[PDB]
Each structure stands twice: as C-alpha cells, then as structure tokens.
Design a protein around this ligand. Structure first.
Ligand SMILES: *[C@@H]1O[C@H](CO)[C@@H](O[C@@H]2O[C@H](CO)[C@@H](O)[C@H](O)[C@H]2NC(C)=O)[C@H](O)[C@H]1NC(C)=O
Ligand SMILES: *[C@@H]1O[C@H](CO)[C@@H](O[C@@H]2O[C@H](CO)[C@@H](O)[C@H](O)[C@H]2NC(C)=O)[C@H](O)[C@H]1NC(C)=O
Ligand SMILES: *[C@@H]1O[C@H](CO)[C@@H](O)[C@H](O)[C@H]1NC(C)=O
Ligand SMILES: *[C@@H]1O[C@H](CO)[C@@H](O)[C@H](O)[C@H]1NC(C)=O
Ligand SMILES: *[C@@H]1O[C@H](CO)[C@@H](O)[C@H](O)[C@H]1NC(C)=O
Ligand SMILES: *[C@@H]1O[C@H](CO)[C@@H](O)[C@H](O)[C@H]1NC(C)=O
Ligand SMILES: *[C@@H]1O[C@H](CO)[C@@H](O)[C@H](O)[C@H]1NC(C)=O
Ligand SMILES: *[C@@H]1O[C@H](CO)[C@@H](O)[C@H](O)[C@H]1NC(C)=O
Ligand SMILES: N[C@@H](Cn1oc(=O)[nH]c1=O)C(=O)O
Ligand SMILES: N[C@@H](Cn1oc(=O)[nH]c1=O)C(=O)O
Ligand SMILES: [Ca+2]
Ligand SMILES: [Ca+2]
Ligand SMILES: [Cl-]
Ligand SMILES: [Cl-]
Ligand SMILES: [Zn+2]
Ligand SMILES: [Zn+2]
Ligand SMILES: [Zn+2]
Ligand SMILES: [Zn+2]
Lengths: 689, 689
C-alpha cells in the first residue's frame, strides 16, 4: 500500500518543473552556481520534511581552462606559419545572456605545445593500437594522434595513446558516432552540430577519487600528494574538437589507406592513417593546451530519514548534480528525479510513516571530474558505510534516450528489479495497458534467458563505483536509453544539453522520466522498509556459473599452454558449486525464519547485507588498490563496461604476446586461486554453523 | 553465579595431569607426534561435550635440519685446517629413550657455507648496528657476525645483520641473559647449561603467515609463490650455539675493546669486537647450514559451543600446541590450561547452560614457524571473523616465571581484566587472603597510574597477532612472568623445557597456572555471555591521549624541522579530542539502552564490536600489507613489542639521518594525517546519528 502511495504521488509535471528550474544556468563543479544549486536542494529537502540535510565539503583537485591562454590545435607549414587554427561558439538559442559557459576542453590534460606529424587512430581502443603496431606498420611514437570519441571512456583512449608513445591526442566527435540518421542538428533536431565539442575529464583514476588524496577524504588537514604525483593525471596534452574542425585536420592525411570500413567514419575525407599529409601548406600539427589544475572546494548535500527499527542500516539514494554546461540530461534529469523522490517520501512522512531502516539522500558534486564528491564521502564514512549499508541506488541521468529501460545491478537485486518493473505502468507508446517490465522485455531481452529483460554487469561510469567496486555495497542504476549506432547520445557533454532538448525531443510528456523516478524510488523503499532484505542469493549463484563458463571458454584457445603450465580452473568450478549449494541452503533456511524473533531476523539480514562484502579483497586488483571486487571490475580497456572475474581476465588477456610465458601463466594461476578462495569464503558467510 | 562455577570447577591437579600427559614426547609442528596430540585434544573436547571439534589442515612451508648434512660452525687456520667445530647432546634425565629431538637450528635460515672474519654485534639491535657503523668504525659488510640472543625477536636480529651486510649470523645464549644469579643449571636448578642452544625461526614475516601464500589460506588448490620469493625468508645463514661454544669463538677476538659495559656479557672473555682474531691457529670462522624447507601439512583443532541467542557472534579462545622439543612451558602449559577451561565449560553444559554468543576453541599448529596455523585459519575465515568476532583470548604459555601476572590487551579490555582479577584468589605466597588484582598491583604497578596494575600494548609474539593487527579483533594475553635481568626464561626453546622443570622450579602446587586458567576462562565467559559486551571505550579515549602526547614528545627534538617543513600534530590532537567526546557520549547513551529491546541492545553491541575494526586500514602500513592497525603495530625493531602510532613512529625514527629531508618530513605528515582520519572515523562509528 505504502509503496503504491510513494509511486503514485510522483508526477511527471513536477519532474518537468524541477528540471526547468535547475537548467537555466551552467552548474560546473567548483563554481558559485553549483554551490547555489546545492543550497536550493538542501532548502527543498528540509521543506519536504527530511530529518537532516547538510552540506558536506571537500577540497579536491579540479581543472579548468585558462581564460587568458586559450587552448587550440593548429596546422603550420614548413615556414612555421599557422595555416589553420581550431576555434568559439554562442550559447544556445534562449541562453544569449549566459556568460560563463566553459569552453570545450578535457579536464586534467597535461600542459604543452607538442608539434609533429598526425596519425588517425580510430577510437584509440586497445585493439586499434594493437592493429596499428602489429598489422599496419604504424609507429605512433612521437606523433600527435587524432581519435574519434565513442565506444570507450575517453581516459582509456588517452592511457592507450600514452602507452603507444604519442606526444598529444586530439579527440573529436565523428558524425558516424554522434549524428543520428535523418535527424536535424540542434536547435531544429537533437543532433550534434559540427561546431560543438564534447567536454570531459581524461584521468585514469581506477577508483581513487581526488587525485591528491587516494584512500582518505580530502579534508582541510589532509596530507596531499604533490600535484605532479596526482593519481591518474595524464602526461600528454588532450583537447576535443568538433567535426567541422576535425574534417579539416583529417582531409589531407596521407600514408596508408584505412585498413577496413570499420576505421572510416562519416566525414567526406578518406580516413587515411598518416603519418603526415599529402596533396596540400599543411605540414605539421600543433596542440596548445594550458588548462589549470587547482584545489577547489566541492559540496555534497547529504540528508536522512532515520529508521524507526534499524537506524543503523542504510539505503543510499545518490546522484550527482554538477554538469559540464546546463546538463539537462546529464545529470540534471536525475537531479529532478531525486527531488521528486525525496518529495514523495516527505509526503509519506506527513501522514506518519517512517521507514524501518535509514534512507541517506545524497546530491554529489564533481562527478564529472572523476566521481570525486561521491568517492571522498565514501572515503570519509567507509567504517559506517561498510558495516551498515544495505544498498546504493544511483540517480544520474534518467533520459539518455527514449526507447526502453537499461538496468545495471548486482545479481542480488535482479529479482527486486523485475518485481518492481511489473508494477509500474509502461510509459511507452503502444504499451498503454502494460507494465514497464513488459515493454523492457520486448525491447531488450537477456541473451542468457529470452524470457527476462537484460541486466548488465556493473563497471563504472557514475557515482555508484566506489560503493560497489571498493566497498562491496549492492548497487543498481536504471534509466531510459536508446535502441542505434551512435555512442551515448549526440549532444552528450556539450552546450546543447538544454531543457528544450529534453522537452521537445526526448520526453515531451515527462512520462518516461516519471517511470524512472518510480523505479528508483520503489527500489529504495523496498530495500529500506522490508523486514527481510529483498536480495536473492541463488541469482548470484547462477551468475557465477555463467561467469565461470565464460572465463573458461576464453581460455580454450590456450588449451595447450594450460596443460604445459599446469593451469586448471577446477578450483574455481568447485568454489562455484559450493556457493550454489550454500545459497540454496540459505534460502531454504530463510523461509523458515521466525519473523517475530528480532534477533533471528537480524542475523539473517546481516548475512544478506554482508554477502556482497565477501567479494571485496582489501589487497585490491593488480595495480589498482581501489578496485577490490573479485567478481566484477570496470574493464581495464573501458571503465564504462563491467568485466567479470577481472583478475583472471586481465591475466589472460593478450597472454600470447607476453615476453615471459612462465611468469604470465603463473599470474593466471594466482588469480584463479584468489577467485576460488573468495567465492568459497562468500559461501562460508551463508553457512548456518 | 555461573562465572563462579566456571572458575571454581577448574583444578590445579587437572592442569598438572594434562601437562604431564602432553609433555612425554617432542611435538614439533609437522611431525606425527603433533598430529597425535591434535587428535588427543579433539577426543577430549568431544568428551567434554563441545558441539564440534574438527581438524582443519593447511599445507605450509616448514623448515628442518637435514639429518644427513648436519649444521655447524667452525674455526679454520690459514691452511684450511678445522681447529674447532661446534657440536650434540643427550635427552634430559628421564627422556633417554626419546629419539627424535630436533637438534638446535634456526628454522628458515638460508643455506650456505660462508667464511670470513668474525665481528661481535651485541644483541644485533638497530641501535647496536648504528653504534658499530656511526661511532665505532666497524664495517660488518662481508663479515660473519655473532650476536647474543635477548632483548628482541631473533628474526629482527637477522634482518638487521642482513642490512649491515653480514654474510652469516651466529646466535648464542649469553649467561648474562639466560643464567639467573645463584641458580644451578638443569637438572639441579632451572638455569641454562652451557651445552644447550635456543631454537627458533628467523623469518621476517610482518604478519603474512605461511611464506608461500600471503593473503590467502594455504589449501590444496592454492597458488604458491616460488620458494625463492617466500615472504620473510632471510638471505644469509643463521645458526644458534650454546655458551660453551660461543666462549671459544669469542675468546680471541681482536680489534677494538668493547665500547662500554653494556656490550660485555658474562663469559670469561674480553668482548672485543673484531674483526679478526689475536693471540691464537684461529684465523677465519665458517658456517655450514643446510636446513631443508618443505611444504608440510599442519593441523589446527577447531571446536565450538554455539550461542543460544547470538550464534553469529564469536569469542575465540586459541592457543598453540606445537613446541620445539617437549615445550613444557611454551606452549604446553597453555595447552593444559586450554583443556581445563574447555572441561569446565563442558561441566556447565552438563547442567543445562549454554552461552549467549558462540565460543570458538582453537588449538593452533606451527606457531613456532611464524604463527602459521592461527594466521592461515584467520585468512580462511576472515569474512566471518571480521564481521562477527567479539574478542580473541590467547592460551600460549601460562607460567614463564613465578613472580606475578603480565597482561597485554587492547584498552577495550582493561576494565574487564581488572574486574575479573579482583575476584580470583591470588596464588602468591603471602597473599593468601587477597586477590590476584591485589598481588599484581603490588608487584607491577602501571607507570601511568600507580593505583592500577600495568597492562602492555599488543605487538606480536604469539597467535593473537593476525586477529588484532590484521583483523582488528579485540585481543588479550595473560600469563605469569618474572620480576630479573635475564630475557624470556633461561631454558626457553631448549630441550630442558620439561614437565619436571615446571613442577620442581616454577609452580609445584600448580596454583599459579590455575589462576591463569581462571582468568582466561573468566574473560571468555564474560565476553561470550554478557548481554552488553563488556568493553569500555572511554579507556580507549584515555589511551589515545597518552599515545598522542608520547609521539608529540618524541617529535620535540625536531621542533625546528617541524616548523621548516610545515609539520603539525594539530589534526591528531583534534581527532583525539573528538574521539573522547564521542566515547563519553556513547557510554552516556549505553546506560540508557532498553535491555528488553533486542534490536536496541544489538545495535549498541555492534558499535562495541566494530570499534576496534575502525582502526584497521586495508592499505596497511608502509611495506607491511598485513599490519593494518593504525594505533598499534609490532615494533619494526622488535616484533615482540607493541608500538603506538606505528606509522608516525616509523616515519620519524632516525629522521635526522635520512638522505632527503623534504621527502622524509612529507612521510611524517602523511602518517599524522592517516592517524587523525582513522581516529575521527572510529569516533564516527560511535555517533548516534
Ligand atoms: C568445495 O567443497 C568441497 C567439499 O567440502 C571441497 O572438497 C575437498 O577438496 C579437497 C581438495 O581441495 C579434498 O582434499 C577433499 O577430499 C574434498 N572433499 C570432498 C570432495 O568431500 C572443495 O575443496 C571446496 N572447494 C573450494 C574451492 O574450497
Ligand atoms: C573534530 O571536530 C571538530 C568540530 O566538528 C572539527 O572542527 C572543524 O575543523 C575544520 C578545520 O579542519 C574547520 O573548518 C571547522 O570550522 C571546525 N569546526 C569547529 C571547530 O566547530 C575537526 O576538524 C574534527 N577533527 C578531525 C581530525 O576531523
Ligand atoms: C594563465 O595563463 C597566463 C598567460 O600564460 C599566465 O600568465 C597565468 O599564470 C595563467 N594562470 C595560471 C593560474 O596558471
Ligand atoms: C616505434 O617507433 C619508435 C621511433 O622512435 C621506436 O623507438 C620504436 O622502437 C618503434 N617500435 C616499433 C614496434 O616499431
Ligand atoms: C523519441 O521518440 C520519438 C517517438 O518514437 C522518436 O521519433 C524520436 O526519435 C525519439 N527521440 C530520441 C531523441 O531518440
Ligand atoms: C640432505 O643432504 C644430503 C647431503 O648433502 C643431500 O644429498 C640431500 O639432497 C639433502 N636433502 C634434501 C631434502 O635436500
Ligand atoms: C662498508 O664496508 C664495505 C667494504 O666492502 C664498503 O663497501 C662500504 O662502503 C662501507 N661502508 C661504510 C659506512 O664504511
Ligand atoms: C619460584 O618461586 C620461588 C619462591 O619465591 C623462588 O625461589 C624461585 O626462584 C622461583 N622460580 C623461578 C623459576 O623463577
Ligand atoms: N561520468 C563522467 C565521469 N567519469 O565516469 C567515470 O566512470 N569516471 C569519470 O571520471 C564521464 O563519463 O565523463
Ligand atoms: N613465538 C614464536 C614464534 N614467533 O613469534 C612471532 O611473533 N613470530 C614468530 O614467528 C617465537 O617467538 O619464536
Ligand atoms: Ca581522497
Ligand atoms: Ca596464507
Ligand atoms: Cl543512474
Ligand atoms: Cl597467552
Ligand atoms: Zn552523469
Ligand atoms: Zn557526465
Ligand atoms: Zn608459544
Ligand atoms: Zn615458542
């Protein structure tokens, strides 16, 4: 009943009004406007009747362009004359009086003015650089590389380019990846204009949080690394340009033809690889990048509704509010959703309801600079969060497309997600009498089971990362997305993410955003109020069987080497079998618990709460102290994607090219052994005696 | 009432019979006799009525002499003729038919036959090597060094000798340190004969457990490091000799006179330092050490009495049973105590009692080889132990001397220790109508408070180490000790630790051993059965104030450098003040808890249980992944001693001699900041909201 009142109280029109109110001005992390927005959210939470709503600050390293030394890329001739220089642009229609839009840049780029020959490196993925070096005869050492955005997180591209020896990397938005067919560019449609460039940071933090204070919250007194030693800071310049400018740089590239169609984007240029130019005054490319890194105060808003029975157990509903410009999709659509969820919980409170456990609401700052606000607060509060948290539900963008739902969560949460989506009306045209679960199932069926909707593994990409990958708190993300060959959505991280874009092109009725609010809010409600925490551990058992089969299958091409080096997956399969038995027995006992015996209920709830924690190894993964989950990690090739059995996967990846096979296969054996132990230990936490 | 029945049921005569029964034969780890002893303990626990008693095994690296390539030290002349060779000895009187006594050796010594000039290095402490190099003009590089046992753990001596460049280290027992005045050598008295040598391992494990499997339990499937990479294995030979042989080696040392009386032991030799000989055929010293390292199965016995109310909360009573020879003091006096405690808990069970929480009884194997059995079981069971354990009470030697009690424990346990000692009769002559607390107070008053008995900080030395220093489980150790300039007790780790030694010289009535059994058992009982866990966190607050003053005082000699490098202790003192306030508030709330509300009681018990855990940093201390407690660690100079604020202490130690002062002071700032954060976080765990 109460769940229905929570869901039914939420209104599309309220989400619309919140979104309009938060998207009139830019709200970049570390700027006065994003502090004002924090205070507005805080005022609203107090009005809604939350028990607390406080600003919690940190002083973390941020990065901004230098207003008096603007960044650019140029082409010079052999006489050092600048022949072309990249450029810039007015605010979107209606925003003419907005004066502090940050120009395009890649936060945390190194400073410098490298000059050299240009080489096109496709998406700058690991496989693209392998191809260049191993198949194409191209040496990127000492070159400036140009890569198209898309497919993977941009910091991975920069890491890859550094490894390949490039001295600078230019990123651009190819219309193949950011221009949907038969749609007009903004403002007439929702596509990316050729003058616009995508902002975004290019760190490789691997879960560290503020670069200067890995492991510990960035308080006033806190020891800071020297900036030159900041974690994840790239060592070459990086800058983004739009496709009009990229076309000019790519047009006269010479050398080898593109190797196959998968390397050719959509511009009217050959997509030859370089190095060097042909057919032109075009002689060398230069970058000039002089962004400033500076310690800057950021502010989270953290509020609570204290539990009436288990105040020392938490469900976290957290979403970022900092944007690159107006951020009407990212994150402000999620900011509006979070406010409407908080308002609805306040309405329940007004009629005398209080949750069983405690809800923590959080509006995070500086997500765009490396998940900084959410990570520093996890670092501050780790001791209470790791011993008391039930789950983390994110509230970043709600409306990245208008096709269907996309959910990423731990297997613990699959059952609850499917249950709740069955009870929320579908917002989709043609599904007027059906549930969200029904439309989602039709539009995105699971590859492993055709009669369930797809749910993806957690890697990174938003503020749940430290909660799940470092602390082992069950996490979930849900939002509307596209069906569509473009990456993200066309105007992602540009000036064109405006309220008008969302209202006109994405979700005019706000019904799709409403459905996402209802699901996020209902997840928090069931996790915080149910007497027995609504996880299912047998779904985790089945997931482990799938992951074990997958990593074993990846090893088959090396079967002879497994034999010769005495590598076996037997202990991993044995642990998975033992875990399946323990999970079955646990659920058999759980249905017998005496619901009227509070300590009996609390003991089994502690087993449900602590199961995800069992997968966290304090030693971390190789080279990555802050990714500690043995079953999942963000991919080392693309932090946006989750990878299963990451220690094993990274040990076996490209193993045939390792210099020392005996050493390489011993590392595979190491990670197989760690994974077998960790699963067996997790199974041990479920045992009755 | 029940506590009194537990204590009063224990009998001195039963401890005596157990001790006699377990000390007839050697019971070295990894040998058949110590497996037989495990099975005997298991049979007894089942007879006593424990709910379970199982053998839990691991396969870990152990080290033994080679029966067909005996170790020795020799002196050769310039013609390579052996002039002297160290030797060996019959079993003690009454043990003539015992055939498998392991000869003296230092387990895990490197193999080799180094030859060189000899140098005497006193106790081979850090300060002894500083003196040699910085004051005395002695260069130990390329020398064989001879050090007397005592003052510090022998593995620290070996680490120090390796750092100083020695190519081998001979250890010996000087009568200054192992021969008590006016006492006869065994068998006529309890002193060390000149033919006897002290066994013991010489690893530098820093909490790792089995050298081949740091971090993970050594199961059948487990990945193992290559033996050459085993953690803590020294790289030079080490071998122990008795004082008759050491006298021969020291007699003709030449070079500089001993620098002061603190370098001169008690033998009739000059204690000149070397290098080299004078006044003799004595030309060079050789070692010949060829012990075998081999993976060997070890067995813990692990038993339980399941709790009736909180079966998912644990109090661990653990003690080792492996010895070097008969081990009548170490550990077998503790083995006999543990059996008598288990028997008494069984007697309570026979009359219908069951504890509130679960007792775990453990008889550990291979403590003498590096705390191996207890550490591998902590590594196996870490996920349940870290989330559920209340405390660990050790049960190693009970009777290291006959003067008074020595207790080492976390501040959480001070109040309970004082309470229980007031209710146990003193076994001491002259104290027939007084409590153990009263005799202990008279004989060993605390330096920080003259009206309380001394309680020491926890470092290492026995099986509590991983539980406290890695996992943050409140731990305590209690035993009888000496008053007395000798180190340990004279026959420590020799063939002469016999039942006859204990009965004739240490505790003929067994009353002192009985008092230790009563205290260990009463500690387990109160921790496992009290509705509210009996810790006091204000005592921890007071301890932190003392430790903060101590480390700040140590910094005063560097006051100018603190100023010049911007180093301040302000945040540490601020955290300590905040912790004191939080601990006061917590106890003010604790007295108000509704004892009839099980969830209210469980929430506050979880805060008491999880407070010690808050001090554990998963990143570890510098260079030491497995010492994680920020308030205490085993000293880096002597693992037997506890050091407070170890990260700060090691950063400031000898700082005036660091090559780079800017870098060195930044590391001091780092560790001050980590300590301030950790204390503030621990304070946060106590907060109500
Ligand atoms: C899964 O549980 C089984 C049964 O407890 C474990 O099987 C034991 O495996 C060891 C070898 O590692 C054998 O010595 C025992 O005989 C096995 N007992 C059986 C089959 O009853 C197995 O090790 C567990 N898996 C893991 C990864 O711990
Ligand atoms: C101890 O608690 C006090 C009070 O909450 C903290 O004091 C704040 O300290 C910061 C500087 O670090 C100031 O900006 C605030 O004005 C202080 N507030 C006060 C004095 O009311 C103090 O930081 C805490 N200590 C630690 C180590 O976290
Ligand atoms: C911005 O660039 C100008 C011109 O190079 C320079 O003088 C100034 O120091 C820069 N600002 C910062 C904070 O580095
Ligand atoms: C890459 O090119 C650079 C040119 O300086 C050279 O140092 C390096 O060895 C080359 N590597 C390959 C694989 O060609
Ligand atoms: C939104 O949905 C409408 C109706 O299906 C469709 O025409 C449009 O392309 C979708 N918009 C976006 C931005 O994907
Ligand atoms: C013991 O030493 C003998 C003589 O050197 C040798 O032949 C044998 O291999 C050694 N045993 C082991 C296990 O190394
Ligand atoms: C120690 O003596 C060795 C002799 O080989 C030498 O290498 C080293 O530099 C000397 N150090 C000091 C402090 O005398
Ligand atoms: C044991 O106590 C007696 C009586 O005080 C004393 O003479 C003897 O030295 C003590 N024994 C040991 C081994 O310290
Ligand atoms: N969501 C942002 C921030 N970004 O996401 C991560 O996972 N790390 C990181 O900095 C982006 O994609 O730029
Ligand atoms: N207690 C034993 C074992 N030893 O104690 C440690 O603390 N480490 C270690 O190996 C000894 O002192 O030889
Ligand atoms: Ca930090
Ligand atoms: Ca191990
Ligand atoms: Cl989200
Ligand atoms: Cl002990
Ligand atoms: Zn976002
Ligand atoms: Zn973003
Ligand atoms: Zn011992
Ligand atoms: Zn010992």
């Amino acid at each position: 009943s109460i769940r229905w009142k929570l869901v039914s109280e939420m209104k599309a029109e309220n989400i619309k009004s919140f979104l309009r109110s938060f998207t009139k001005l830019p709200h970049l992390a570390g700027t006065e406007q994003n502090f004002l927005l924090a205070k507005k959210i805080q005022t609203q939470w107090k009005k809604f009747g939350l028990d607390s709503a406080k600003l919690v600050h940190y002083d973390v390293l941020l990065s901004y362009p230098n207003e008096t030394n603007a960044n650019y890329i140029s082409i010079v001739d052999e006489h050092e004359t600048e022949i072309f220089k990249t450029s810039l642009e007015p605010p979107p229609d209606g925003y003419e009086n907005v004066t502090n839009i940050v120009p395009p840049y890649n936060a945390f780029s190194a400073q410098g003015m490298p000059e050299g020959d240009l080489v096109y490196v496709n998406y700058a993925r690991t496989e693209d650089f392998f191809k260049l070096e191993r198949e194409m005869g191209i040496n990127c050492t000492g070159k400036i590389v140009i890569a198209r955005y898309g497919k993977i997180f941009r910091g991975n591209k920069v890491k890859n380019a550094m490894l390949a020896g490039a001295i600078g990397i230019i990123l651009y938005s190819d219309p193949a990846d950011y221009f949907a067919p038969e749609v007009q560019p903004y403002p007439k449609g929702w596509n990316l204009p050729g003058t616009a460039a995508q902002r975004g940071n290019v760190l490789n933090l691997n879960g560290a949080g503020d670069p200067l204070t890995p492991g510990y919250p960035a308080k006033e007194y806190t020891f800071r690394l020297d900036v030159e030693e900041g974690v994840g800071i790239p060592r070459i310049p990086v800058h983004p340009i739009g496709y009009n400018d990229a076309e000019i740089l790519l047009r006269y590239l010479g050398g080898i033809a593109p190797p196959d169609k998968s390397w050719k984007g959509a511009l009217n240029v050959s997509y030859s690889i370089g190095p060097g130019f042909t057919g032109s005054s075009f002689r060398k490319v230069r970058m000039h990048v002089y962004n400033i890194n500076k310690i800057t105060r950021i502010y989270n808003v953290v509020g609570t509704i204290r539990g009436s029975v288990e105040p020392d157990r938490y469900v976290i509903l957290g979403g970022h509010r900092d944007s690159w410009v107006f951020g009407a999709i990212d994150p402000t659509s999620g900011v509006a959703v979070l406010q409407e969820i908080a308002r609805s919980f306040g309405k329940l409170m007004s009629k005398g309801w209080r949750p069983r456990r405690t809800i923590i609401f959080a509006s995070w700052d500086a997500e765009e600079f490396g998940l900084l606000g959410s990570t520093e607060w996890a670092e501050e509060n780790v001791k209470i969060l790791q011993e008391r948290s039930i789950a983390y539900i994110n509230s970043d963008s709600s409306i990245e497309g208008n096709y269907t739902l996309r959910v990423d969560c731990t297997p613990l949460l699959y059952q609850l997600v499917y249950k709740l989506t069955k009870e929320i009306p579908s917002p989709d045209d043609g599904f007027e009498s059906k549930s969200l679960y029904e439309s989602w199932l039709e539009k995105d069926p699971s590859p492993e089971n055709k009669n369930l909707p797809r749910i993806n593994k957690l890697g990174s990409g938003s503020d749940f990362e430290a909660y799940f990958q470092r602390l082992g708190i069950a996490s979930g993300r849900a939002r509307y997305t596209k069906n569509d060959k473009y990456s993200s959505y066309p105007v992602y991280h540009t000036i064109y993410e405006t309220f008008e874009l969302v209202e006109k092109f994405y979700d005019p009725t706000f019904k799709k955003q409403l459905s996402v609010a209802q699901l996020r809010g209902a997840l928090v409600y069931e996790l915080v109020d149910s007497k027995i925490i609504p996880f299912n551990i047998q779904d985790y058992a089945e997931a482990l069987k799938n992951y074990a089969a997958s990593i074993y299958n990846l090893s088959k091409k090396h079967d002879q080497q497994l034999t010769d080096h005495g590598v076996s997956f037997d202990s991993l399969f044995s642990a998975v079998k033992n875990f399946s038995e323990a999970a079955s027995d646990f659920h058999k006992r759980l249905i017998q618990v005496d619901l009227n015996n509070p300590i009996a209920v609390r003991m089994m709830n502690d087993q449900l709460m602590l199961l995800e924690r069992a997968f966290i190894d304090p030693l971390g993964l190789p080279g990555k102290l802050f990714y500690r989950h043995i079953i999942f990690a963000p991919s080392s090739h693309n932090k946006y994607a989750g990878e299963s059995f990451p220690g094993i996967y990274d040990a076996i990846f490209d193993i045939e090219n390792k210099a020392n096979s005996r050493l390489a296969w011993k590392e595979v054996k190491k990670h197989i052994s760690i994974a077998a132990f960790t699963i067996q230990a997790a199974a041990g936490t479920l045992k009755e005696v």
